[PDB]
Amino acid sequence: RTRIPFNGVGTSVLPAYQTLSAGQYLLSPNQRFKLLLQGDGNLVIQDNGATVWVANEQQPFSSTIPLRNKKAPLAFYVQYGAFLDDYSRRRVWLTDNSTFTSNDQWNRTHLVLQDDGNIVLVDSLALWNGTPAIPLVPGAIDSLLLAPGSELVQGVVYGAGASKLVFQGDGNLVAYGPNGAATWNAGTQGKGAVRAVFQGDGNLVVYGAGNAVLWHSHTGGHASAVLRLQANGSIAILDEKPVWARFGFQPTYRHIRKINPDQKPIDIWTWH
Ligand SMILES: CO[C@H]1O[C@H](CO)[C@@H](O)[C@H](O)[C@@H]1O
Helix, strand or coil, rough: CCEEEEECCCCCEEEECCCCCCEEECCCCCCCCCECCCCCCEEEEEEEEEEEEEECCCCEEEEEEEECCCCCCCCEEEECEEEEEEHHHHHEEECCCCCCCCCCCCHHEEEEECCCEEEEEEEEEEECCCCCCCCCCCCCCEEEEEECCEEECCCCCCEECCCCEEEECCCCCEEEECCCCCCEEECCCCCCEEEEEEECCCCCCEHHHCEECCCCCCCCCCCCCCEEEEECCEEEEEEEEEEEEECCCCCCEEEEEEECCCCCCCEEEEEC
């Protein structure tokens, strides 16, 4: 497959096979960090407007090889690994990802600029997307993550910024957006719902009386998935793993999500 021009300037994610051009940039969800391809061929990260990182030979787990083709436009893109074509320096700067497991990874691996200023290549699969019209926004300290095996106790309001997820008194399971309107619901109100759980097997289920299944996300069989509610009202179940990062990452290290002091996971990757 071939690349298309990037069109998500200001978002936190650069999808696979999309060309990032000079003057284009990513922003972490919290707006603090910016990943910018400068007109002079330097790919840079800025912290509150100040360069704190530059893509070069000194970056651990990256390679630089010659670019012979003088016709190659200044461009940055992801094709499993990340590549920077900079003919002004006869160079291609690229990431040394961890060992690939399948060709599929080329289609689902994208780059994210996290709220902690790290850039991370993430092999990302949306198993279920309850709110397709709302953009997925990875790397936000804002987001609510639930690990498999989490009970949604009835009446408790789980928050993500101004958004919320609630297994309500009427038995409906509802996600509310920042404007207070519902972005998604299971439609289980008044059907006798007793229990709502993101199960260990990665399935989100609303149960009625006698363990009758009232609704489920059909995502069973994925114990590594997480349920994410975003501050923008998005709700989805995703199976994800990092395959590269500018810091923290090591090819042999075990990947894991940072945790709140409250033992809850956040949408930030770290290693070993
Ligand atoms: C008909 O209303 C129901 O569903 C909406 C969202 O669709 C909820 O917000 C509400 O509380 C009810 O359970």
